[PDB]
């Protein structure tokens, strides 16, 4: 499904989420080239990724090159692995950097590793159309070199509160509690949750989730965990059973 995501047109026959707009994953004035399984495609800011072709509830992986066109020619600025986690009403992306442009010689690349979240999108649940009871979510938490995290989350729509936890990441300090937090209305009037992240009794950062699907089937977003090495980013996506 990787080559097809790069070569085939959007087809509503494929399982949703059908597509994802790459607003954050491609910066204005730059281009993003993805390659996998013998195919490639280049994206500009605002283009859509064909997530329809990707498998649900798993991380799909592409090689990426972030490029800039300067007076006709394409210069590589960064390369590595582009990750996409697909659910039915939501999706998110992330970047594992492996190389960056040398700071002095534009034509040279230098080994360098780092990790960051890209886009989060899908069919946002309207704040004023939230369901009634309580809901349980289960899914994935993924960070640099580790897609084996397990996300547990619970929403009480009556109290408009959510809370949960991350387990099983290889780095134990990343297995944090996602502390109780209020469901609020976005600037786009979408339902969102912003909360603290905790380990033991202590605050360790923050998390941010959007609620997706007509019936709040899904949550997705990310967490930042403060560490002595220092901030670690974790992608988050879960769904009702």
UniProtKB/Swiss-Prot annotation:
Residues 87-149 are annotated as: Domain B. Residues 150-240 are annotated as: Domain C. Induction: The amount of protein increases as cells approach stationary phase (at protein level). The record marks 189 as: Important for antibody recognition. InterPro entries: FHBP, FHBP-like_C, FHBP_N, OMP/PagP_b-brl. It is found in: Cell outer membrane; Secreted; Extracellular vesicle, Bacterial extracellular vesicle. It comes from the Bacteria. Disruption phenotype: Bacteria are more sensitive to complement-mediated killing. Pfam families: FHBP_C, FHBP_N. Residues 1-86 are annotated as: Domain A. It is a lipid-anchor. The keyword Nucleotide-binding does not apply. Keywords: Cell outer membrane, Lipoprotein, Membrane, Palmitate, Secreted, Signal, Virulence. GO terms for cellular component: bacterial extracellular vesicle; cell outer membrane. Part of an outer membrane vesicle vaccine; antisera against this protein induce efficient complement-mediated killing of the homologous strain. Three antigenic variant groups were detected upon sequencing of group B strains; antibodies against a single variant group provide reduced protection against the other 2 groups. Thus inclusion of an example of each in a vaccine may provide adequate protection against all strains. Recombinant protein lipidation increases its immunogenicity. This is the variant used in the 5CVMB vaccine. A bacterial surface lipoprotein that binds host (human) complement factor H (fH, gene CFH), binding contributes to the avoidance of complement-mediated lysis by N.meningitidis. Binding of fH to the bacteria surface is independent of bacterial sialic acid moieties. fH binding affinity is high enough that it may sequester plasma fH, depleting its circulating levels and de-regulating complement in the host. This protein induces high levels of bactericidal antibodies in mice. One of the major antigens of group B N.meningitidis and a powerful protective antigen. It is highly variable, over 300 protein variants have been seen (see Factor H binding protein sequence typing website). The protein in strain MC58 is called V1. Binds to host factor H (fH from human). Both fHbp beta-barrels contact Sushi domains 6 and 7 in fH (also called complement control protein domains, CCP). This interaction probably mimics the normal (carbohydrate-dependent) mode of fH recruitement, regulating fH activity. Sucrose octasulphate inhibits the fHbp-fH interaction. Belongs to the factor H binding-protein family. NCBIfam families: factorH_bind (NF041466). Divided into 3 domains by antibody recognition; domain A (27-119), domain B (120-183) and domain C (184-274). Domain A contains linear epitopes that are common to the three GNA 1870 (fHbp) variants, antibodies against it recognize N.meningitidis cells. Domain B contains linear epitopes common to variant 1 proteins but antibodies against it do not give a robust signal against N.meningitidis cells. Domain C does not have linear epitopes but antibodies against it recognize N.meningitidis cells. Bactericidal antibodies are directed against conformational epitopes located in the BC domain. This is Factor H binding protein. The lineage of its organism: Bacteria, Pseudomonadati, Pseudomonadota, Betaproteobacteria, Neisseriales.
